[PDB]
């Protein structure tokens, strides 16, 4: 437990978990929306996906 | 599989058999088929006469038998 | 059933990006998920091949040979439309390949990583710093003969490193890196060391080959000798009239029927698992092409 | 008259089935009816009845 001869620094990074609020303007974005699409495949031997 | 096979191709070639014609041939891999991916395999017992096996069971199968290929 | 995969991009690309996208529609591509909805990492041959790292060609042709295949279909400037090529379908193709080969319509074709080159293969996208890379697709005998290329280069690249003098590797690049077809030469890019994966193929074409390399058959030497010593055929054009010397010392036991059929079964049963392995890539099989197209119909 | 126009579905394939004549020993009654089977080719001419093994008789066949 002698000094060397240098000093040094130490450097971590931490993180915080936090409960934010955010507050939007009215009327900031117009949004378009589309029809939706069912469509189907992977038809395997015994069960199909959509 | 050859990695796989490696430790017992390395005892059974070892000194306890040597070589000869015939006896070069090691192993033998054939295919099966195809089945769904990500799906896996679920563990179930097999009973039989108050006796359970742990079989994997595979669903949604595809049976697709192929040739033999020839591996040492 | 319906197969469309629409790859969303975060951020809009540049004029610039769009119009060098969009001189590539009809492209062959890897994406390594089968979903409607895909990001633009997982997507083409880039997070495998990097700007800094030496070119290993054998890890991506497995990469390939695993991840999904897709055909260019739509460039927007937000989002990417391209179609699915599932193991059991018809699909017509379109080839305008830069560096081109001539289309038969009769065999397969095959998907290779691009070895010819990097920047006329690649495009780059700085709107979402991403790199996007095309693989090469050939015939299946050209494709077959650029594998053979590299693999050899990469065992004499390995053996003349204790080797006396440059014209020996000088000697080692002319018909090695260079395929030479009708009416040009085309440059491979070769690693100057190939050293992940090279070794775990070059290996078990090593055990291979010591292992037919005992059961030969006896007869097929005899008539080799017999024929180089007097007739001349293009495939006996190697061999001059001098004949090499290991075959006049393993010929000289006399010819038993009976062992030379049992051999000749065995190095059969070995030469049917040599030729898997040499395949490594998804090889598409054409059945018509049209030149005045450039399209065919894989299948 | 209206069907037969969906040409396919998906590339869609009906079973191939095999039908395999068995001695009442070699082949045990009961069984996962998920098992794969094994067909082992005899050496009689104009044979009738042919060999089947599972993984188990598999097995026990090697000792």
């Not at chain 2, 059974?12 to 015939?22: C, G, K, N, S, T």
């Not at chain 3, 179609?83 to 018809?90: H, L």
């Not at chain 3, 290779?112 to 991403?130: C, I, Q, W, Y």
């Not at chain 3, 000697?171 to 030469?185: F, K, P």
């Amino acid at each position: 437990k002698i000094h060397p001869g240098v000093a040094m620094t130490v450097v971590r990074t931490d993180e915080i978990l936090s409960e934010n609020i955010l507050f939007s303007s009215r009327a900031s974005t117009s949004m378009f929306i589309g029809t939706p699409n069912v469509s189907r495949r992977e038809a395997r031997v015994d069960a199909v996906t959509f | 599989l050859r990695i796989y096979y490696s430790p017992s191709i390395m005892h059974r070639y070892a000194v306890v058999q040597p070589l000869h014609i015939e006896e070069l041939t090691f192993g033998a891999v054939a295919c099966l088929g195809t089945f769904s991916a990500t799906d896996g395999w679920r563990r179930s017992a097999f009973n039989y006469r108050g006796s359970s096996l742990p079989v994997v069971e595979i669903d949604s199968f595809y049976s697709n038998v192929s040739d033999w290929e020839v591996i040492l | 059933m319906d197969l469309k995969v629409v790859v969303s991009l975060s951020s809009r690309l540049y004029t610039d990006e769009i119009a060098k996208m969009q001189q590539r529609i009809g492209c062959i591509l890897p994406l390594a998920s089968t979903h409607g909805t895909q990001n633009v990492q997982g997507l083409g041959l880039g997070q495998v091949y990097s700007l800094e790292t030496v070119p290993d060609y054998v890890s991506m042709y497995n990469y390939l040979s695993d991840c999904t295949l897709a055909v260019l279909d739509e460039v927007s400037v937000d989002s990417l439309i391209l179609t699915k090529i599932v193991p059991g379908q018809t699909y017509a193709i379109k080839n305008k390949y830069q560096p081109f080969f001539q289309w038969h319509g009769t065999g397969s074709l095959s998907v290779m990583p691009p070895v010819f080159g990097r920047e006329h293969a690649t495009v780059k996208l700085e709107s979402n710093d991403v790199d996007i890379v095309f693989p090469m697709v050939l015939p299946t005998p050209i494709a077959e003969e650029v594998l053979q290329k590299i693999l050899l280069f990469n065992v004499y690249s390995r053996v003349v490193m204790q080797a006396p003098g440059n014209a020996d590797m000088l000697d080692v690049h002319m018909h090695l890196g260079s395929v030479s077809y009708l009416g040009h030469h085309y440059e491979l890019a070769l690693p100057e060391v190939p050293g992940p994966l090279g070794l775990a193929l070059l290996d078990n074409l090593s055990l291979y080959f010591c292992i037919m390399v005992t059961l030969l058959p006896r007869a097929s030497m005899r008539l080799v000798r017999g024929l180089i010593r007097h007739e001349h055929h293009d495939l006996l054009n190697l061999f001059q009239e001098m004949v090499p010397d290991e075959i006049a010392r393993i010929d000289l036991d006399d010819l038993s029927v009976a062992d030379d059929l049992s051999r000749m079964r065995v190095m059969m049963t070995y030469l049917q698992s040599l030729a898997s392995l040499f395949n490594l890539g998804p090889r598409l099989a054409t059945a018509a092409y049209s030149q005045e197209t450039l399209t065919a119909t894989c299948w | 008259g209206s069907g037969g126009g969906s040409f396919s579905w998906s590339g869609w394939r009906p079973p191939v089935f095999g039908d395999f004549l068995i001695h009442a020993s070699s082949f045990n009654n009961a069984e996962a009816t998920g098992t794969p089977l094994f067909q082992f080719k005899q050496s009689d001419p104009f044979s009738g009845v042919d060999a089947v093994f599972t993984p188990l008789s598999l097995f026990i066949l090697m000792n």
